[PDB]
């Protein structure tokens, strides 16, 4: 039964806390909590493979992906791990989080603790966008906020 | 090989960034970075339990401690262990930071990552304080910066 906390933040308006519970090791791990800040309606929800934070949420490199596959949703086979797909932020902008997927870890390969977690601009496509930006990334827009996987209590 | 990397942060003016490296598994670890906006002269440095930021640095626990131990400095046998000693403010407010040990990993079940290092407002008296927060804390007063330690290129 492992948990982490990511704390998100960023140059604008966008602030979150995500939570991760994972109740047995390669179970599904439920994920949740809530972003603010955000416009309303969708945006890209994915986990970057570096927990570097160094030049703000550029340094978080590319989209965690160990077993090298293309971009796709958290519901298609072809995905990348990192892949969460996205979140919906109501009127008032805030975002109430809650995912379930068996394909992230808190432990053991396909661990996510230590890397980064992000949100951005627009919607994840889940690359069917018909442009390269889509096959890559989904073509989500810009970064708005990010921070380090935790381990917690 | 393994590489790790953590932005410190706080409410006040004392930032930086810190690196690990261990090239081997299970073997020491080099942490080396800078650290600013701090008072001239020694400051508490240590790895706490919990990657957890939420409520600033307050949320991620006591020092890490697998091994139930006291505190202590990082030369001593009974240590935290993350307990990394002291760091160094010049007269400018920068510490350039330079360590090596081998209790704390970037691996295995003394592993770092995602757990959270923290500077402190004081000196951390390395548990020769003669009272109860000097084997618990090392009496270091308080956490000017922190963030949570993540995978690195
Ligand atoms: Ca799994
Ligand atoms: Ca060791
Ligand atoms: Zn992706
Ligand atoms: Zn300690």
Redesign the pocket.
């Given at each position: 039964a492992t948990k982490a906390v990511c704390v998100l933040k960023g140059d604008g308006p966008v602030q979150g806390i995500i939570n991760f519970e994972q109740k047995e090791s390669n179970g599904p791990v439920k994920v949740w909590g809530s972003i603010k800040g955000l416009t309303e309606g969708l945006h890209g929800f994915?986990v970057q493979e570096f927990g570097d934070n160094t030049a703000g949420c550029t340094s978080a490199g590319?989209?965690?992906?160990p077993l090298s596959r293309?971009?796709?949703g958290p519901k298609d086979e072809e995905?990348?791990v990192?892949?969460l797909g996205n979140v919906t932020a109501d009127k008032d902008g805030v975002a109430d989080v809650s995912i379930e997927d068996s394909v992230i870890s808190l432990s053991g390969d396909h661990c996510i603790i230590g890397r980064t977690l992000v949100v951005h601009e627009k919607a994840?496509d889940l690359?069917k966008g018909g442009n390269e930006e889509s096959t890559?990334?989904?073509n989500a827009g810009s970064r708005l906020a990010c921070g380090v996987i935790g381990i917690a209590q």
């Open positions: 994915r590319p989209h965690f992906n293309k971009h796709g995905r990348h990192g892949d994840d690359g890559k990334t989904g």
